[PDB]
């Protein structure tokens, strides 16, 4: 069906059809325009008028331009041909390697799996990181959250988890970028073409062969409108639902800055005519997120493991967006600036961090008791911060001084040099197994490492490195 543009306000477009209207979520193509401008219907207003959100910039549009209804929502290709390839929200590849020769296309918008078609089985992940392997175990086939401000190491943590999981996964995987730096996007593309996660081969006649790849890529970045940022996660979720529904495989799904999915709505609703909520957020802040998260779930057909990075504006964890997001996660990891300023990396706060896979019926009883003892120790050390700041450690008793010593020691022991940090840290990376972490924590709690210094635990992995470093520091 043909239609006319009547009004344009930033990332919003009002269209007028004569004969027959399109339903909501349907896609429309603008004709008198340089590029392929696509509009997604959002509302109906009367007078055969329709409101839409543009997947690109509106500079150049005219009141009178012509629009064509595709009759269906946005359609992204699916198959094993999307593997080893980048794809924007409208499915168009931006890898400059040719088109996507996929048979079938899926809709960006799909209803979530039902209640009966869910399977909550407790598994674990081998991340190689001590803090999460000990105190916040990650759930195979569940959702994981990395909450943090700006400059605390979310992207670095995600790159480390990619290196330590996806390469050792075998199944498929997807990476979505919602307002992330194009630099790090290109860096991930090149690190994947290096490590073999993406296997590009230049056939003659300029063709390409991505056969052998094990990771798809979807990128809607900061250089994109809100309409082109609030619809990328849905594309990635369609790409993963194809795998875990038809192919039956277990997939990974890394997402970078899901917060933008809300920020876009916040800089769109005002133009859509909606009343703002507390901090300018939407009234639909909970449903627009739940309709995204309920598509992420293990089922009887396959499994989605998910790793979402959640921005925290102004370092405020009481914001409505993270507050709502906390309810949807199976595992959590809250990074802190107070802990990053101490040079500890990963700067994970093990008290705000939590999980559901820490119970003794999932991890053993020695693991459970070690984790709970560590939490008790760190809380007892937190409780003395005020009196230490005012008066000093000399006021404390000897039990409290022992607690403070072991708490600082286990803080410095819960730090790890990653492999991707070698470029600006120099020191090589340290994968750390779980029984080694547990033995080390047990010994540090018992008191078999009180003789050692405090700076001997900094960036050492296990305890053999700590003891060698204490030896070398004795000189």
């Amino acid at each position: 069906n043909h239609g006319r543009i009547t009004q344009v306000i930033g990332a919003v477009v009002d269209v007028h059809f004569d004969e027959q209207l399109p339903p909501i979520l349907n896609s429309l193509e603008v004709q008198g325009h340089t590029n392929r401008l696509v509009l997604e219907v959002a509302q109906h207003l009367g007078e055969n008028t329709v409101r839409t959100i543009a997947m690109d910039a509106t500079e150049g549009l005219v009141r009178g331009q012509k629009v064509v209804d595709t009759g269906a929502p946005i359609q992204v290709p699916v198959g094993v041909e999307t593997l080893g390839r980048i794809m924007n929200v409208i499915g168009e590849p931006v890898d400059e390697c040719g088109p996507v020769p996929a048979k079938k296309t899926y809709s960006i918008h799909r209803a979530a799996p039902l209640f009966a078609d869910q399977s909550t089985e407790p598994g674990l992940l081998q991340t190689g990181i001590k803090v999460v392997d000990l105190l916040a175990p990650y759930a195979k086939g569940g959702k994981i959250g990395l909450f943090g401000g700006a400059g605390v190491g979310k992207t670095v943590l995600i790159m480390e988890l990619i290196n330590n999981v996806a390469n050792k996964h075998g199944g498929f995987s997807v990476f979505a970028g919602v307002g992330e730096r194009t630099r790090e996007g290109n860096d991930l593309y090149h690190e994947m073409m290096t490590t073999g996660v993406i296997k590009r081969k230049k056939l003659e006649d300029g063709k390409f062969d991505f056969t052998g790849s094990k990771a798809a890529l979807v990128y809607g970045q900061m250089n994109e409108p809100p309409g082109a940022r609030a619809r990328v996660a849905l594309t990635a979720l369609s790409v993963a639902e194809y795998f875990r529904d038809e192919q039956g495989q277990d997939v990974l799904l890394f997402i970078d800055n899901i917060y933008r999915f809300t920020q876009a709505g916040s800089e769109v609703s005002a133009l859509l005519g909606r009343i703002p909520s507390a901090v300018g957020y939407q009234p639909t802040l909970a449903t627009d997120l739940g309709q995204l998260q309920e598509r992420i779930t293990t089922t009887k057909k396959g499994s989605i493991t998910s790793v979402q990075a959640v921005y925290v504006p102004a370092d405020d964890l009481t914001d409505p967006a993270p507050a709502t997001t906390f309810a949807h996660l199976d595992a959590t990891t809250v990074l802190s600036r107070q802990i990053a300023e101490l040079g500890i990396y990963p700067a994970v706060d093990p008290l705000d961090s939590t999980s559901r896979m820490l119970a003794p019926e999932i991890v053993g009883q020695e693991h459970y008791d070690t984790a709970r003892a560590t939490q008790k120790l760190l809380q007892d050390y937190k409780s003395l911060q005020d009196i230490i700041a005012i008066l000093g450690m000399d006021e404390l008793s000897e039990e409290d001084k022992l607690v403070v010593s072991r708490a600082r020691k286990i803080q410095r022991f819960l730090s790890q040099p990653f492999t991707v940090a070698e470029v600006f840290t120099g020191k090589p990376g340290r994968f750390v197994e779980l029984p080694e972490t547990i033995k080390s924590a047990q010994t540090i709690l018992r008191g078999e490492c009180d003789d050692l210094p405090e700076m001997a635990f900094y960036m050492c992995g296990g305890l053999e490195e700590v003891r060698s470093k204490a030896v070398k520091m004795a000189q």
Binding site: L391, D394, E395, S397, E398, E399
Partner: protein, 52 residues
């Protein structure tokens, strides 16, 4: 017999800390050779420091 002098109020810096440190050193040095040690003290701070 080790007579350790100390105070009864707090906020005294770390003087009783150093006292109890020297006392621990002396006790651990003199109990190796086998000399039976007894401890006399003045103040509650040394008591709280060396009880356990």
């Amino acid at each position: 017999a080790v007579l350790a002098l100390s105070s009864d109020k707090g906020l005294c810096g770390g003087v009783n800390s150093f006292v109890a440190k020297q006392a621990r050193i002396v006790i651990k040095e003199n109990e190796m050779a086998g000399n039976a040690v007894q401890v006399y003290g003045v103040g509650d701070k040394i008591r709280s420091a060396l009880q356990r």
